[PDB]
């Protein structure tokens with residue numbers, strides 16, 4: 001049980017990148033892994049002010065004991081974007097860090113590419129990273145075999161896995177068809193990263209006091225008020241062990257302290273022991289505080 005999995009409990013865009021960077025600095029994982037499809041990017045800003053805006057690489061690459069960065073089979077990514085992000089952190093991606101691209105990850109020329117991979121037509125060798133790697137040497141250094149992927153996980157000591165969009169955007173939650181093309185749940189993220197279920201140690205769920213994006217019945221006003229019902233649904237399916245509540249700096253103390261209580265009452269209502277353990281008051285490492293301290 002050595003995988004910490006970071007997920008988003010609402011409609012996304014909760015600052016999951018911030019807690020991923022924070023956790024990577026605090027815990028020093030040697031392996032960071034994700035399986036993202038094209039997105040608007042995940043941002044982490046460290047103590048000294050450096051900014052990482054990532055659409056492909058995990059934000060966890062800031063771990064001081066980084067050894068492996070792993071892009072899972074569910075990844076859909078642009079090669080241009082990936083090489084740009086690698087170069088901007090080449091000081092972190094030195095000779096001591098191995099980057100592994102799952103052979104069945106999808107290369108973009110998002111949904112049309114996901115369809116062509118599912119088509120499994122034997123003479124289209126332009127789709128999956130294994131096939132693109134034969135004529136595109138930029139990723140040839142990076143794509144591994146399925147066997148190598150499994151050995152990398154076996155060899156990892158502690159793993160930070162970063163999830164994708166947020167629970168309520170799941171393909172099979174209530175808002176279909178106004179949703180993404182995948183379920184956004186721990187089971188599906190682990191599946192899309194090829195992580196065996198017994199490796200899961202804890203799930204860190206993220207939320208913001210006023211969630212961004214129909215919607216849930218108990219929320220109004222895109223920015224919405226906090227939804228207790230949305231949090232109940234997310235707790236039942238996602239069962240986080242710890243919660244990071246972000247953008248508390250947009251509310252009065254009474255404001256975000258009430259939401260802490262509501263999150264924990266929703267958790268308990270859906271047989272989840274989650275604790276609100278982290279609070280976010282800004283976009284920086286230095287703005288993440290421990291709930292027991294504030």
Ligand SMILES: Nc1ncnc2c1ncn2[C@@H]1O[C@H](COP(=O)(O)OP(=O)(O)OP(=O)(O)O)[C@@H](O)[C@H]1O
Pocket residue numbers: 008012013014015016017018039040041042043164165166246247248249280281282283284
């Ligand atoms: N507490 C905060 N105060 C102010 N700005 C913040 C705060 N937290 C994050 N931000 C800013 O919000 C943006 C974060 O990107 P986003 O939240 O969509 O990441 P994510 O949740 O990791 O992404 P995704 O939706 O893909 O899961 C950044 O520009 C960051 O600087």
